[PDB]
Design a protein around this ligand. Structure first.
Ligand SMILES: CCN1/C(=C/C(C)=O)Sc2ccc(OC)cc21
Ligand SMILES: [Cl-]
Length: 349
């Protein structure tokens, strides 16, 4: 219910978890009026606010717990978001960057422009009926465009997944639900790592994680290209390419679907226990063996239609899913792939 901004903004306390005790109608900075809850987690809470210094426009305000490790992780996210903003003065490269950040009584707070549903939540709301190829194509183009910019500015996202890709507007027609506008933005730069910085060993979410990270061979921009390839497959079929929670099984799935791992990646890994005489150790006859052999087929076998536009998609996905990160297509190269000849002039600009 409605409260005054000066009063609400100074009336403040935390709970035993170091969350800010707040509810709908509370204010921050005599500026942000809380009108809803967007999400929550170990880090803190995300609340929808009206921004009264900007005609009451909607924002997603992330409010971090009064806990040191979450405070410090947010400070890093903020420093990445500042560096991206300073490289993209005018926001041509489709990242969800901050509109504001401040320290509210030990709470790091980060404001973002409020966008629509993420590409996972839209798919779930459609009963996991996949995106039509034209939408996959436009979305593919935008991901390539966004990450290419970051990549050529010595940055790697490391955690691209459908939940971190947002529709500017997720309003839909019923034809299956079909989004009216396929414009997307790339979110969640908390893990993003510059070329010169320490690379944490295990990056990406399981389904989107490339072989060089599983085998601990060193990772860079190509990690994001593998993630994008997995994302395009899931947009196109509506289920993840790699339905697994264990490295050995995951690598076997990669072989069943993409062909053999290059021998020099097997030779270089510390993870020798996954291999015997240079081949993956795997029981074809076990319960998991039977499941993988029935469910994990060559990548081309997942095509829904045979027309050229579908061949072009599957060829680009093959290139984004090359085992050897040195041989994997770059996003600069991907943008020249003939799959993108199919974009409308409107999508292409
Ligand atoms: C909770 C979603 N959410 C965020 C979540 C985290 C963990 O950061 S950041 C964000 C930005 C825009 C938005 O539009 C809808 C939503 C949004
Ligand atoms: Cl080990």
């Amino acid at each position: 219910s409605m409260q005054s901004s000066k009063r609400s903004s100074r009336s403040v306390e935390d709970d035993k978890e170091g969350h800010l005790v707040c509810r709908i109608g509370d204010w921050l900075q005599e500026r942000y009026e809380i009108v809803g809850n967007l999400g929550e987690g170990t880090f803190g809470k995300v609340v929808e606010c009206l921004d009264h210094a900007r005609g009451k426009s909607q924002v997603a305000l992330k409010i971090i717990r009064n806990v040191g490790k979450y405070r410090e992780a947010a400070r890093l996210e903020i420093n990445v978001l500042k560096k991206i903003k300073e490289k993209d003065k005018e926001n041509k490269f489709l990242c969800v960057l901050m509109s504001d950040w401040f320290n509210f009584h030990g709470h790091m707070c980060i404001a973002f422009e409020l966008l629509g549903k993420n590409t996972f939540e839209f798919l779930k709301e459609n009963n996991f009926q996949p995106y039509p190829l034209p939408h996959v194509r436009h979305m593919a183009y935008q991901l390539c465009h966004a990450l290419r910019f970051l990549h050529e500015n010595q940055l790697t996202h490391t955690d691209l997944k459908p939940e971190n890709i947002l529709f500017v507007n997720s309003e839909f027609e019923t034809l299956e639900k079909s989004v009216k506008n396929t414009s997307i933005r790339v979110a969640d730069f908390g893990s993003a790592t510059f070329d010169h910085e320490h690379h944490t060993t295990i990056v990406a979410t399981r389904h989107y994680r490339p072989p060089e990270v599983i085998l601990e061979l060193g990772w860079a921009q190509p990690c994001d290209v593998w993630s994008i390839g997995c994302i395009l497959f899931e947009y196109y079929r509506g289920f993840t390419l790699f339905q697994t929670h264990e490295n050995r099984e995951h690598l076997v799935m990669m072989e069943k679907i993409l062909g053999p791992i290059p021998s020099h990646m097997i030779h270089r890994t510390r993870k020798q226990k996954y291999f015997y005489k240079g081949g993956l150790v795997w029981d074809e006859n076990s319960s998991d063996g039977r499941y993988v052999k029935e469910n994990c087929k060559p990548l081309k076998s997942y095509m829904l239609q045979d027309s050229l536009e579908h061949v072009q998609l599957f060829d680009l996905m093959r290139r984004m899913l090359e085992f050897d990160p040195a041989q994997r297509i770059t996003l600069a190269e991907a943008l020249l792939h003939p799959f993108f000849a199919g974009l409308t002039p409107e999508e292409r600009s």
